[PDB]
């Protein structure tokens, strides 16, 4: 038995993470030596990602591209608490890559003192295969090394979604506790009333 549904327009809340940037995963041709996406000092090519501060959509999901500084262009995951506007949410969206594919926990913190551990998988930056049914956010043609631009070696960034099943007001998130995991952008999607089509 199949019945058509209708869901109201939700709201996207693009989280300003400029204050949490703690790691350089991206370099231009003039600062190849600043790359710390991995232990080997690789990085995404700046030329193959959006301009800092720009509004983008990945599979329709809006993100703000981080206002990078010399010492940070992403969150290398160390269990950072991220304040979010209080509200009822359905989904967390992350633009992310991992130093080899890995899985961990995003905690959602609710007003009533409940916290939910939400499973999150992030696939490899190194010409990765999606292991967690992510969508491709960026698949570059090249990769930056400490001393050269490597032709014909994709650097991969992933769009991952994480459900927030609890009907309650979420106030903050905790990012994973893993040096392997990198978050480039974070967007929340509010709950929207679903019903039968009239």
């Amino acid at each position: 038995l199949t019945l058509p549904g209708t869901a109201s327009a939700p709201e996207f809340r693009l989280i300003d993470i400029d204050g949490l940037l703690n790691n350089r995963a991206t370099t231009d041709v003039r600062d190849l030596g600043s790359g710390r996406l991995n232990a080997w000092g690789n990085s995404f090519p700046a030329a193959e990602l959006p301009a800092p501060g720009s509004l983008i959509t990945v599979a329709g999901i809006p993100f703000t591209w981080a206002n990078a500084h010399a010492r940070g262009d992403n969150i290398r995951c160390e269990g950072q608490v991220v304040d979010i506007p209080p509200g009822q949410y359905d989904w967390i969206y992350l633009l992310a890559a991992s130093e080899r594919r890995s899985e961990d926990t995003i905690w959602a913190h609710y007003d009533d003192g409940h916290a939910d551990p939400l499973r999150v998988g992030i696939s490899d930056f190194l010409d990765g295969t999606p292991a967690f049914g992510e969508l491709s956010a960026f698949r570059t043609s090249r990769m930056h090394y400490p001393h050269h631009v490597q032709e014909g070696l994709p650097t991969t960034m992933w769009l991952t979604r994480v459900g927030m099943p609890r009907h309650g007001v979420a106030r903050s998130l905790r990012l994973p506790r893993s040096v392997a995991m990198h978050v480039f952008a974070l967007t929340l999607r509010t709950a929207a009333a679903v019903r039968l089509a009239e």
Binding site: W107, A115, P117
Partner: protein, 330 residues
């Protein structure tokens, strides 16, 4: 006199909570601060309110971080003069009763079960009782009905293999807070959590299964018994009884951690609360697999072993989350 219980809780936490609230104490802080696992072979009684307290008093062990104490009394004679004298001295008696003889209990003249309620007023003809266990009741019952429940032989009942065969024996519990409570500040919560974790991690004595290693040994011993045997039946009866108030304390400890998470906006306490609630929930899998094996001969040893293993893994994870929570408040 305030009705107080939780869906994971029994008349044990409920009646103590009423006594604490009467004296202006927060039952979540007092009864929710302690979190432990102990099982003493042979200690359990077929009573909804069984908790292994030795060497502490029953209320003492359930309120380990507070100067809270209880004494058990067996009332001589055929009346309620001892309870009248207790009330006149400002004590709230907690009476050992059989639900079979309580008109407001679903069990009335149907199921024998050893239970606790609060007595808060006595007249020539009526005993005023407070019982928060669903369905909650507060008010007068006939003296004769109270005496019937308070004096019940609570005989072995095929319809209640867990909480029958424990005479009421006109037993009642007197509770007192014998000094001022500790200020439940960040440093106190940190110390409570560290003391709970240290006690869980401690290698147990030979004669008492305590903490994480004790839980492992207890569940291994339990799963080693052959389903349907008299040995298994006795062990599964014990399991259901002891695990009620151990599960109840798990739920209360999670609530205690959530309350302090909200008070101070410290997310580590909410995260720890989730890990502790996972243990509370893990007890459901173990004790209900046990219950259906015991009562309905639903023998699922692979399921019991699965739930037992999940409960241990959840406890391991909870203790690690609790150490992160202690660090966030200490």
């Amino acid at each position: 006199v305030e009705l107080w219980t939780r869906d994971l809780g029994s008349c044990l936490h409920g009646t103590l909570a009423t006594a604490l609230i009467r004296d202006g104490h927060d039952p979540v802080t007092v009864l929710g601060a302690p979190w432990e696992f102990r099982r003493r072979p042979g200690a359990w009684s077929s009573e909804e309110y069984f908790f292994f307290a030795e060497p502490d008093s029953l209320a003492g062990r359930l309120a380990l971080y507070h100067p809270f104490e209880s004494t058990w009394h067996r009332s001589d004679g055929d009346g309620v003069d001892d309870l009248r004298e207790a009330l006149a001295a400002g004590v709230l008696p907690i009476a050992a009763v059989d639900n079979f003889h309580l008109p407001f209990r679903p069990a009335f003249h149907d199921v024998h079960a050893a239970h606790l309620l609060v007595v808060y007023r006595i007249t020539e003809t009526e005993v005023y009782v407070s019982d928060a266990q669903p369905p909650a009741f507060q008010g007068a019952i006939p003296l004769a009905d109270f005496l019937a429940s308070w004096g019940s032989l609570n005989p072995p009942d095929d319809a209640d293999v867990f909480f029958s065969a424990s005479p009421s024996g006109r037993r009642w519990l007197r509770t007192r807070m014998t000094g001022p409570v500790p200020e439940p500040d960040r440093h106190w919560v940190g110390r409570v959590i560290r003391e709970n974790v240290a006690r869980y991690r401690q290698e147990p004595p030979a004669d008492t299964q305590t903490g994480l290693p004790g839980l492992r040994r207890y569940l291994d011993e339990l799963c080693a018994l052959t389903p349907g045997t008299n040995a298994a039946s006795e062990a599964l009866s014990e399991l259901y009884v002891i695990s009620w108030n151990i599960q109840a304390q798990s739920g209360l400890h999670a609530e205690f951690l959530r309350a302090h998470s909200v008070k101070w906006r410290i997310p580590e306490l909410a995260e720890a609360a989730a890990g502790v609630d996972a243990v509370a929930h893990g007890w459901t899998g173990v004790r209900m697999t046990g219950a259906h094996s015991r009562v309905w001969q639903r023998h699922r040893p692979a399921e019991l072993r699965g739930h037992a293993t999940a409960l241990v893994r959840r406890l391991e994870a909870a203790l690690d989350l609790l150490e992160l929570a202690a660090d966030a408040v200490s």
